[PDB]
Design an enzyme around this catalytic site. Structure first.
Site, mmCIF file in Angstrom:
data_model
loop_
_atom_site.group_PDB
_atom_site.id
_atom_site.type_symbol
_atom_site.label_atom_id
_atom_site.label_comp_id
_atom_site.label_asym_id
_atom_site.label_seq_id
_atom_site.Cartn_x
_atom_site.Cartn_y
_atom_site.Cartn_z
ATOM 1 N N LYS A 260 0.827 -1.217 0.000
ATOM 2 C CA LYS A 260 0.000 0.000 0.000
ATOM 3 C C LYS A 260 0.858 1.263 0.000
ATOM 4 O O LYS A 260 1.566 1.557 0.989
ATOM 5 C CB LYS A 260 -0.960 0.031 1.202
ATOM 6 C CG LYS A 260 -1.973 1.171 1.164
ATOM 7 C CD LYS A 260 -2.630 1.413 2.525
ATOM 8 C CE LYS A 260 -1.889 2.472 3.337
ATOM 9 N NZ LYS A 260 -1.698 3.753 2.589
ATOM 10 N N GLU B 240 10.902 1.806 9.881
ATOM 11 C CA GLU B 240 11.672 3.057 9.747
ATOM 12 C C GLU B 240 10.780 4.230 10.092
ATOM 13 O O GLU B 240 9.867 4.604 9.353
ATOM 14 C CB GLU B 240 12.324 3.273 8.382
ATOM 15 C CG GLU B 240 13.417 4.349 8.443
ATOM 16 C CD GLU B 240 13.219 5.473 7.442
ATOM 17 O OE1 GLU B 240 13.721 5.373 6.305
ATOM 18 O OE2 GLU B 240 12.553 6.468 7.793
ATOM 19 N N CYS C 196 13.812 11.622 6.238
ATOM 20 C CA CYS C 196 14.174 11.242 7.596
ATOM 21 C C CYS C 196 15.667 11.435 7.895
ATOM 22 O O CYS C 196 16.049 11.456 9.046
ATOM 23 C CB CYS C 196 13.730 9.806 7.906
ATOM 24 S SG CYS C 196 11.946 9.506 7.795
ATOM 25 N N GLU D 177 10.719 15.846 15.484
ATOM 26 C CA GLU D 177 10.875 15.899 14.031
ATOM 27 C C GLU D 177 9.886 16.879 13.408
ATOM 28 O O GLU D 177 8.698 16.863 13.736
ATOM 29 C CB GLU D 177 10.701 14.513 13.406
ATOM 30 C CG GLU D 177 11.158 14.476 11.948
ATOM 31 C CD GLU D 177 11.080 13.094 11.315
ATOM 32 O OE1 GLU D 177 10.322 12.243 11.828
ATOM 33 O OE2 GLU D 177 11.771 12.864 10.293
#
Ligand SMILES: NC(=O)c1ccc[n+]([C@@H]2O[C@H](COP(=O)([O-])OP(=O)(O)OC[C@H]3O[C@@H](n4cnc5c(N)ncnc54)[C@H](O)[C@@H]3O)[C@@H](O)[C@H]2O)c1
Ligand SMILES: NC(=O)c1ccc[n+]([C@@H]2O[C@H](COP(=O)([O-])OP(=O)(O)OC[C@H]3O[C@@H](n4cnc5c(N)ncnc54)[C@H](O)[C@@H]3O)[C@@H](O)[C@H]2O)c1
Ligand SMILES: NC(=O)c1ccc[n+]([C@@H]2O[C@H](COP(=O)([O-])OP(=O)(O)OC[C@H]3O[C@@H](n4cnc5c(N)ncnc54)[C@H](O)[C@@H]3O)[C@@H](O)[C@H]2O)c1
Lengths: 475, 476, 476, 476
Positions: free
Chosen positions: B173, B247, B281, B379
């Site tokens: 997906k 991740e 990232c 983040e």
């Protein structure tokens, strides 16, 4: 008898509720033993965090030497360790002395070597002007939780690769079997820097629960029930901890028509009932080719009825009791609901095997189908079920039709059949013409709901290390 | 026209459920409406993967190798088409996609075709007298695989190549915002793999994604995305003890010492702090600059950053694209505003939305952030970099390590000693010296701590998607 | 054009010395006369390798990997021209080349393209306090590679792929009889690789080969051929401590126990004793059959072998081809006639030359040979198989191990116990169980004892061509 | 009173041939006379090794690992005795042997105990459909091992630990001048291993070593010594295709850039150029110094070196011992004399003999030598170091690479860029950065070019003494 928790640079009685440590052979209390408070758990984890700074910076040689010294210390006291284990678990004394201790000492020594022997893709210029290399570094603080069935060996499997990876560790034995852990703690405290290994005691729902939820803990390792592993993943989810799960198994035993039935029966006799069948690798789900099915059941029934247990002399005992009254009643529950069926028969045993203690009679369940409870679900006792298949059936497919995936065996003299089975079985281990045999260079660990991660082998140490890419631009 | 259909076993078909409005993020204009996979379509995709597993788990490495090479060829043959499509859907400057992303994608599929034929293990032998042992790396089963929107096609490479390569089957997906290149690759892949090995379904995380990660037959879930999403995946995995590959994003620290090449450091952050509008990232986003060079670095970086080109008519002249959505822009806006409320923090450049339409945000330098500020601790995932001064009495490695993230990092200094000490001690999956952001398909990328675990690229990716098996033959 | 020129650095160039009369071994007809290299041309060849090494040794695994894929590609696009030319030069039946050799050759180049990206070593780390160590595998130097005539294009693949793959430059010399495919391939290689990375010279072992292996700039010699030639290579290496890679001879033992699938055994030997007219160092040529099945194995093999088709006009109907030359046929014949004059020995089928023209020899079975017989001790290199009986009292593995050779071997038994004990104790580089002859580009092939050392195929071949280097940085 | 008997299978025997006069190299006084092995004791040792091989080759890794641990433990229990005896035989200062050598020796044996259980190979699996492959690393056979005089006990560890550990049996000959520690180790090993697994003979290279290396049952020869000896070993190996393992000496270049810590460089060369009186193949002996720091280096090195202590009555105050022999001393002196004859060269300190009795030579600095000089081109094996100037016009790595040797090297600079560029282009089995000489048992030591091939220490040493075997089972 050592009763003190190892919390950083000091030994310290637990401050919380006592566990009633029982002799499983007689049911009598060995000792009352207080568990770690949350303050002590935090202290242990804090010490681990402090020791990590220097311990993560040791060379492989330094950590190797430390693992070798733990091995010496155990060897030098193998006898007392063996006796204390035998007492705690009701295992026959010579099984412990002869099978377990050398395996345990070999484990520490094996890890001392693997620590100096990690491999990775070679350093080089993979991008022009840039030099790359791969290191395998410490991960952080490990929370290690051990089952009751092989306490001291479980400690070797958990601690050797964790410490050897440069990690610090807070270790918790099963509430029922903390004994060999507390003695080994006293010994490790004289070899390792303070806080590298910390040892706490207590129940899984309090102390274990606190450890696996502690924010500072980076990786949790556990061996125990599927349910316990699910709790560990649930806690892990809160702070994204790494996990290492060994969650049990109902090991399938596929027996072809051309098997050596005498070898097969003698194999199941010992390896299917070893440690009273409280072993994740226990040979318990037997698939037997139709031509030898009846002979197998018959011959297995009589060879199993000769298995010696609860004899007044611990030299003649072949299997011990179950850990607890709770464990025995569960084994008895699965056996009753099997004896429920008008197509299943208990050919030997089936009853409890003592007044005092938690012994269960070696049991053969025959006629069992893929549908039945005794086949589909783990029994964790001195019980074995047998299921017929035919040359029209794909016995590997049947074996593979399971939530479990730890260990398996195939018995046949035909190299073609044994190798076909070996390539197709969905199990972490497949033995051909044996069962139950472990060597410390080779990995033990599940797939599917048996879990992931390995004990023994370089792979365990890989489980406890972080893979790090370093790239230096020099153009 | 565009590829619109889901790949479900041997069937190409449209989604049944709610349509997503796939948006051009440069303009905010609709590209296409695309329907989500229904629950029935999800189950059918998984069942097709189950059936295909029978044969696929039984192929040899050479056969799988050859399939990976073919997929790579197909992509290479349609490289410009994939690039334009990806540029459209994400607003990435066409040339960044053509030159940086496609060649890395293709090369990924080729790398893994090699890796499949080159797995190692402890050697076979008699470790116990009269018993021969060997170690195999076998398929795990069915993989549920979910991709983020920041690098849709590359992430599909990273998720599929090792998974398929390990002899697994996959239900994949893409992010709800970025399915376009996935449905295109699905067309090519169906011409190469046997049916059901790869199945592509579209939909929202909370609907389609949730159903997939909770499917009883899925044995492994691989997710790149938010920390919160990985926590949800772990909770799902708790139910049937699935394997997981996570991740979960980073906050790459960049330690700059007094003896760094300052010009290099500045051109370094200019590029790697802002590439992909910081939606990466491994973005160079949490800078620690030594006191002696802090002010010159802040001044020079500010100057450098304010020249970053974006939202130009001529796409070849653009250096960075927009953020993916209105939601993403606002979130970045909200982080920056909360940072600017802090009296000790100075936005030296940018700090505001960067276009009249579409989802641009101005490249931003945040000066004076401390170790307990939100902008350093969490983040942001926008074109935003913060700078934190340390002195020679401060252990900057220790500061860098004091984080919940563990993905990627860099150290700049001409001094080999400081550089190797830091490389040695940094708690990050990756540590660059005198550069940042450079990846190579042979080398592993993946985090520790709350960045997660598992690797993408390298043979370790392939190891993650295989089961280690011990076979022991008693012979006497 | 049928390619006839030496590739010397950046020039294609005819040899300037004595011509070799290349023959059609099916017919004995001349194909073309090919001049061999001069000393000057050999010097230029090695010099160009020296020069090319500067840059080539500094390329990345990915760059070398891509070059290998491009070589594979070029061969694949010209598969039929290559197969036709190998068939013409060697007499190999056309479909055997097409279906067996070419695919294997092409897949070798691709396997190495992966292997170049997948070398392992011990991990980088601090093995001494304050010192970071790492291990690299770097190029070795200039390789001089010498090939036999039995599998001309495949030997070139085995010799070049890992040598070039490892960052080395090469001067390759095909055997004097079979240069044709090597020169065709050199032309394709020249359009792909930087000048002088690969150089190709022709000539005789005692002139050109002797000059090449004795060149002071040559750092490593690789040879596949006769034990006497490996000895000559070793003598030459002694002058300048060259590295060596020696595949020297096989006399494959086949142990058949009384509980083997006899139909499989017979059909195995029919294919594997005679494939390539037994011109294969892994040929199933020295059979040990247990007393129980000895007689029947001899009858059934005798009958099976007598049907092997060869020298038919329709090449698609031939199962094996001729020997390479008149000399080689005459050599085979001598071995067989000398064997027949032995009293305890019976030639049950074949034993004569097999054509009025060209160099066919009849597939031959030799029964009742003992460990002391010449036919069993010496490599025959022709379509000849010998059968030796043993009893349940004898240790057939010890008999097999009582040899100077140690290349390949097979054991045939349905008993897993007997099969595994043999596998563990056989002093052979390769042991098959219940088959023979099957190779795969991932698994190593090469000898022990006087069969030599070094591997072809697998990552091990690449390791043979690289130098392990320890780099240790003091950082405190 | 010392151990004097050879170990020949189940027996200790005095040698029966000519006696070697073993000298104290500090005094020239005789230590002991010790008889050589006869040809018959040589054959006996080898035949014992042949017999012991049958059982030893079939032990498990654990069994062998334990054997190595007991040998390590036994040496550790007698560390001081071994140290004293080595210090007597070699004149090495006692605390160098106790603090540096003994711990390295004992750790070498423990390292290999670990490596034995930790060999890796391509994973087992079905590379062809229906065929399970696996890779084993099995023993090679009987090893003939020949050791030099400079590190007697340590060389013994390096030769024996991996050979025994790979499952081989061994006949070991120490250097004729340094047999004492090997005979003492022989007694300890004989209480631990099965008879004939290790055999220890003594004698001259020309008599006993020659007979050993040419013995037709020896399947592998390992020699550490001079290039000439290595060529002789290759010569022998040509006659029966023996495997070889050659460490043939070094001429370690030291590249010193203008931005190196000169204090460190000076202190590095003071120790690592003169350790073991420079009788060490990794001795920091060939210095390339940048034009800007050349004069500074020479001056400061000269100062540092003229303080080196040797031949004091208090051995704990000596930093280097003597040369092993008078022939060695006269060789060193003769090399220096010839350098001094050259008009552009200056001996800045030392350059003469350093003792009335025994074989001391003065630690020597030779300034102004060029690439063309004998003192730069040829190994000296004494306490002598030469310095050559390079400019920023020159490529110093290319200069270092212009050499027949390839064992070890170092680069000194603060600049990480310059260090890593050098480290990647140096053609040397080892490159240290900002140190020299430092070894660790996990990391390989071995050369390229005329320094030989094979590794000592590390898993690679063990791989050198095992044969890679492919086992393939057709199961269908
Ligand atoms: N012993 C095994 O390895 C094993 C294998 C398969 C099945 N089982 C099953 O498990 C049951 C008991 O065996 P066991 O006690 O060894 O396994 P367990 O999972 O109950 O206990 C294992 C360890 O985890 C701890 N623990 C338990 N609950 C916890 C929680 N919520 N959080 C943190 N830690 C927790 C325990 O204190 C113990 O140290 C039996 O019914 C048996 O069928 C055990
Ligand atoms: N092909 C093999 O692998 C093999 C193995 C064992 C025995 N043989 C025997 O060898 C004969 C056929 O010869 P071949 O070409 O296979 O092997 P070969 O040893 O004669 O030649 C192999 C290669 O080495 C070269 N060469 C020969 N002499 C040389 C020298 N003095 N210096 C340098 N290079 C030299 C040749 O030109 C050729 O390129 C047959 O009679 C066969 O029985 C061959
Ligand atoms: N020690 C070293 O590693 C080394 C390295 C390079 C050069 N050298 C040079 O060698 C001389 C010192 O001798 P060494 O012992 O170091 O090296 P060497 O080669 O003379 O001796 C090493 C070993 O080889 C054995 N040997 C010698 N000749 C042999 C032969 N013909 N056949 C078989 N075995 C033989 C010797 O007896 C000894 O055991 C010095 O002049 C020095 O310059 C030594």
């Amino acid at each position: 008898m050592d009763t003190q928790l190892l919390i950083g640079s000091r030994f310290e009685a637990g401050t919380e509720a006592e566990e009633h440590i029982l002799n499983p052979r007689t049911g009598a209390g060995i000792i009352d033993l207080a568990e770690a408070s949350h303050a002590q758990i935090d202290a242990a984890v804090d010490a681990a965090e402090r020791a990590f700074v220097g311990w993560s910076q040791t060379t492989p040689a330094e950590r190797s030497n430390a693992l070798l010294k733990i091995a010496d210390a155990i060897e030098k006291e193998a006898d007392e360790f063996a006796a204390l284990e035998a007492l705690n678990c009701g295992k026959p004394i010579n099984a412990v002395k002869n099978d377990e201790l050398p395996a345990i000492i070999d484990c520490w020594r094996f890890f001392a070597g693997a620590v100096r022997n990690l491999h990775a893709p070679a350093a080089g210029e993979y991008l022009p002007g840039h030099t790359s290399m791969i290191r395998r570094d410490p991960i952080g603080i490990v929370g290690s939780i051990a089952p009751w069935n092989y306490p001291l060996m479980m400690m070797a499997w958990k601690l050797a690769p964790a410490i050897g990876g440069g990690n610090t560790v807070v270790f918790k034995p099963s509430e029922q079997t903390p004994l060999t852990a507390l003695k080994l703690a006293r010994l490790i405290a004289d070899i390792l820097p303070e806080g590298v290994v910390n040892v706490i005691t207590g129940r899984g729902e309090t102390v274990g629960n606190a450890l696996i939820n502690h924010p500072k803990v980076g990786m949790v390792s556990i061996t125990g029930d599927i349910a316990t592993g699910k709790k560990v993943l649930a806690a892990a989810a809160k702070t994204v901890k790494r996990t290492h799960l060994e969650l049990g198994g109902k090991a399938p035993v596929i027996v072809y028509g051309d098997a050596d039935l005498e070898a097969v029966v003698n194999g199941i006799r010992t390896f299917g009932y070893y440690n009273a069948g409280q072993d994740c690798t226990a040979a318990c789900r037997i698939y037997a080719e139709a031509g030898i099915y009846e002979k197998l059941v018959a011959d297995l029934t009589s060879a199993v009825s000769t298995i010696r247990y609860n004899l007044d002399d611990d030299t003649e005992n072949e299997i011990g009791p179950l850990i607890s009254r709770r464990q025995r009643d569960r084994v008895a529950s699965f056996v009753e609901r099997a004896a429920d069926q008008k197509h299943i028969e208990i050919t030997t045993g089936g009853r409890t095997g003592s007044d005092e203690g938690f012994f269960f009679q070696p049991t053969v369940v025959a006629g069992a189908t893929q549908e039945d409870e005794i086949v589909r679900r783990e029994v964790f006792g001195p019980v074995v079920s047998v299921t017929r298949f035919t040359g029209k059936d794909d016995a590997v497919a049947w074996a593979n039709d399971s939530d479990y995936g730890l260990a398996s065996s195939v018995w046949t003299k035909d190299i073609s059949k044994a190798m076909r089975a070996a390539s197709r079985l969905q199990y972490g281990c497949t033995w051909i013409n044996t069962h139950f045999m472990l060597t410390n260079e080779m990995p033990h660990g599940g797939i599917k709901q048996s879990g992931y991660g390995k004990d023994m082998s370089v792979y365990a140490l890989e489980d406890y290390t972080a893979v790090r890419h370093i790239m230096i631009n020099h153009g």
